[PDB]
């Protein structure tokens, strides 16, 4: 009976895989052969931040494209101002250990979590002397790897128990669970419309989840090793994915294919973070090799290189205005780049 | 207006004041990762320092420690172990008696030693349940040569100091298991990290300072590793 289900599953997979050829009538390389490349890009440092004691793991821009927060493993969650290099708040945590951080679109709240399995939400505009924990999102069995705000109330979280979850902060209970992943889910990116999000896990596969329904709309795969980072193309019809196999892969949602693999023979270390530019031409991926390579997302050629940090670059971000890129790293220095 | 820019500069004074005092306490404290099997007795050692993560703090000779027991997550430990690379020293506890799961513990130690991110951090090994191994050998039902054929033709090393009223038969076995741990420690030989094996039991009213003395050696050795004094 177990063999019956295994055999029955194979023809369902076989017909799905066979259909993907029919879709693959050409490659992106032939259609993008004509276009001239971006060529040489010269990104310089602007505003090397200081203040953090231990390695920076995560960061996030705000909607204003001015304030950014980042969490480090020392247990400080401090919000800078990029232009003035100044610390507006320095929020202590209970858990030195924090793998994620997100800044609310309203900017009233801010998210973080790690080994406590709590996406702790903090009020920035507390009338009192110091900021206070609004609501502890307890219930995940495993470490929180990424949590990101949908709205002031709705927040999506990925844990180390292979489950994504939407939470409601007012109610204080997990509303929607996302089951399907085999391995630990590492990253999220919300869609521009905030109706869908993609999430990569330690199984070399990404899954497109519907927020309202709570079911996997579509399953993406083709990566060789544990996936680490994931980000939508700003259109929201496609996304790139960094993995330990030291390549980035663009996946179209509509086409259900893997168009391009961003690999250079020399690079043999995993990708930790990925982000797109506002144009969606400069795919800048942060590597474990203590540098950040700016890939041309169209031509699959390294336009430039941002060899800033001493230790591994953990987190990336691009501003909503698309002025600059920030790169938290294990040397405890957020360098803002432009 | 530019007047408000002075306001944030005054706020930064309090922010900087708090961070600078927070740096003092941060650098003073020693982070330690407590790793081990379910049956290893991680929880037993935490009872000895009378002075879902479980953090414990103990003062020994007025230096603050923080030892992190991680027993909440799933068995998959390839992406949450990365976060303990800044840690001073991984207190790796192992059950000597559980011979079947001893090889699996050895394989776990090999992965920790040869990990990219944990390459720089030394592992304070606690060979726990030494007393329980003592009565197990006298039973003589379970035999190491069944699981480890090299034990059959293995004599005790010269650098052995058995406790009073210990059989030589158990002493060879006792120092074989550590030798198997220390086999991995020497294979890479880049001098970046160093296993500190110790033989411990439940009745041991110690190890508060055994970790202190070993962590003292790494802090001393890490200074000398800079000068090229070794």
């Amino acid at each position: 009976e177990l063999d019956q289900l295994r055999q029955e599953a194979e023809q369902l997979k076989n017909q799905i895989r066979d259909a993907r050829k029919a879709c693959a009538d050409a490659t992106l390389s032939q259609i993008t052969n004509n276009i001239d490349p971006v060529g040489r890009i010269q990104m310089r440092t602007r505003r090397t931040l200081r203040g953090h004691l231990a390695k920076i793991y995560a960061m996030h821009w705000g909607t204003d494209s001015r304030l950014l927060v980042s969490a480090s493993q020392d247990g400080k969650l401090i919000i800078w101002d990029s232009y003035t290099t100044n610390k507006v708040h320095a929020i202590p945590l209970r858990s030195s250990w924090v793998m994620t951080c997100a800044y609310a679109p309203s900017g009233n709240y801010v998210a973080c979590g790690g080994l406590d399995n709590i996406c702790s939400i903090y009020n920035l505009k507390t009338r009192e002397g110091n900021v206070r924990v609004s609501r502890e999102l307890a219930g995940h069995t495993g470490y929180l790897s990424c949590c990101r705000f949908l709205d002031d109330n709705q927040i999506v979280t990925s844990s180390g128990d292979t489950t994504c979850a939407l939470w409601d902060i007012e109610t204080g209970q997990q509303t929607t669970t996302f089951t399907g992943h085999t391995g630990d889910v590492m990253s999220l990116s919300l869609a521009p419309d905030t109706r869908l999000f993609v999430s990569g896990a330690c199984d070399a596969s990404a899954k497109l989840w519907d927020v309202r329904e709570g079911m996997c709309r579509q399953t993406f795969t083709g990566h060789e090793s544990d996936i680490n980072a994931i980000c939508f193309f700003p259109n929201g019809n496609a996304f790139a994915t960094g993995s330990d196999d030291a390549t980035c892969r663009l996946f179209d949602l509509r086409a259900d294919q893997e168009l391009m693999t961003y690999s250079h023979d020399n690079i043999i270390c995993g990708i930790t973070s990925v982000s797109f530019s506002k144009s969606g031409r400069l795919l800048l991926a942060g590597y474990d090799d203590f540098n950040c390579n700016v890939w041309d997302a169209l031509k699959a050629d390294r336009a430039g290189v941002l060899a800033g940090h001493d230790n591994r670059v953990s987190c990336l971000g691009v501003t909503d205005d698309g002025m600059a890129v920030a790169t938290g790293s294990w040397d405890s220095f957020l360098k803002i780049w432009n | 207006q530019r007047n408000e820019e002075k306001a944030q500069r005054e706020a930064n004074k309090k922010i900087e004041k708090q961070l600078q005092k927070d740096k003092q306490v941060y650098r003073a404290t020693h982070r330690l990762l407590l790793l081990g099997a379910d049956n290893s007795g991680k929880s037993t050692i935490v009872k000895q320092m009378r002075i879902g993560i479980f953090e414990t703090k103990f003062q020994v000779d007025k230096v603050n420690f923080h030892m992190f027991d991680v027993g909440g997550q799933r068995d998959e430990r390839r992406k949450w172990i990365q976060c303990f690379n800044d840690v001073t020293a991984i207190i790796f506890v192992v059950d000597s008696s559980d011979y079947n799961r001893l090889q699996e513990a050895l394989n776990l130690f090999k992965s920790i030693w040869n990990n990219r991110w944990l390459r720089t951090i030394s592992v304070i090994l606690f060979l726990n349940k030494q007393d329980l191994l003592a009565e197990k050998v006298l039973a003589g039902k379970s035999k190491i040569e069944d699981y480890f054929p090299e034990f059959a033709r293995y004599t005790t090393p010269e650098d052995a100091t058995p406790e009073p009223g210990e059989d030589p038969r158990v002493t060879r076995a006792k120092y074989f298991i550590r030798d198997e741990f220390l086999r991995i420690s020497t294979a890479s030989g880049d001098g970046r990290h160093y296993c500190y094996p110790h033989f411990t039991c439940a009745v041991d009213t110690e190890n508060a300072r055994r970790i202190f003395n070993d962590c003292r050696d790494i802090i001393q050795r890490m200074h000398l590793r800079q000068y090229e004094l070794l």
Epitope: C202, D203 | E76, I81, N107
Partner: nanobody, 128 residues
Framework: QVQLQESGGGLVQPGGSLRLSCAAS????????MNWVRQAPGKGLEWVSD????????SYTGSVKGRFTISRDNAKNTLYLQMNSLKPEDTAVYYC?????????????????????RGQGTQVTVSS
Amino acid sequence: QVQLQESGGGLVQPGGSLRLSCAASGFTFSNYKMNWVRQAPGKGLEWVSDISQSGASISYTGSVKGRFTISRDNAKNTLYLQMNSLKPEDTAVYYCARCPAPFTRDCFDVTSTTYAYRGQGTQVTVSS
């Protein structure tokens, strides 16, 4: 798509032989370290053996040391295991496993319950 589909294995008298295979597909075989893992009846996953990317640092659990022999053909993209002497304690399902990271000397979680890069497994059994 990463997939390890085994072949061979089955019923055999004690002291017999069995050539297991682990035809790997949807990734480059050549760059990854592989491993064998067996699951005994009413026991956790257990480690069998290893291969260090070229066949250089191969190791065994000690219980099966000096009996089994691993090889790989990078051209054919296949993993092998040899059986010569088989005890009752050796009746178990044998999963072929791959190391998570591509250019590493550490393998984590390969004996985990729900490891991603493990095959369907072959039930190797010894009985009258």
